Amino acid sequence: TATILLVGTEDALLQQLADSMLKEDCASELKVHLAKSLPLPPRIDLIVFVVNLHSKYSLQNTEESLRHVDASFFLGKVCFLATGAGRESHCSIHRHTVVKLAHTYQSPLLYCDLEVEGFRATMAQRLVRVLQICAGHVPGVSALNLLS
């Protein structure tokens, strides 16, 4: 009844995030699809671009994939999720690049270390709520209202 597309090149992290989102409990029935890239080879309510700040390939793949997304998706139905930004080991230039990306496509930029169980759990809560909003399940709040 609410469907999210996770786009990212790290299968394992996408899977653990998906599992985190599916972890109990949710009033709506959540479906998760994963893609390594866009364009894809089903109704999709929310797209989350998971960007690995330690991987230049991740950045490039996000940048390229974005070109295939219809503009109506950026009306609150796209979120960026940067991983590695809280770590001193990450490249600052990449972080700036993704901040500029999220700004350009006027979409939220969220940060999480997906390798940390608790942090990923909380982020999954946030994303479940955003997904429900985008799917029209939250009274008085549409994807349009997410725009800020």
Residue numbers in the entry: 15 to 55, 61 to 167
Kindly provide excerpts from the paper associated with this entry.
We generated crystals of residues 1–171 of CENP-M (a fragment identified by limited proteolysis) and determined their crystal structure by the SAD (single-wavelength anomalous diffraction) method to a resolution of 1.5 Å using a SeMet derivative. The structure of CENP-M1–171 is globular and consists of a five-stranded parallel β-sheet surrounded by six α-helices. Structural superposition with representative members of different families identified Rab proteins as the closest structural homologs of CENP-M. Thus, HsCENP-M has the fold of a small GTPase, but may be unable to bind (and therefore hydrolyze) GTP. Experiments with MANT nucleotides confirmed this prediction directly. CENP-M is devoid of all essential sequence signatures associated with nucleotide binding, hydrolysis and conformational switching of small GTPases. An invariant feature of CENP-M is the presence of leucine at position 52 (of HsCENP-M), equivalent to Gln61 (Q61) at the end of the Switch II region of Ras. Thus, the first step leading CENP-M to diverge from genuine GTPases might have been an impairment of GTP hydrolysis, followed by the loss of other features associated with GTP handling. In conclusion, we identify CENP-M as a ‘pseudo G-protein’, in analogy to inactive kinase domains, indicated with the term ‘pseudokinase’. CENP-M (∼20 kDa) elutes as expected for a monomeric species.
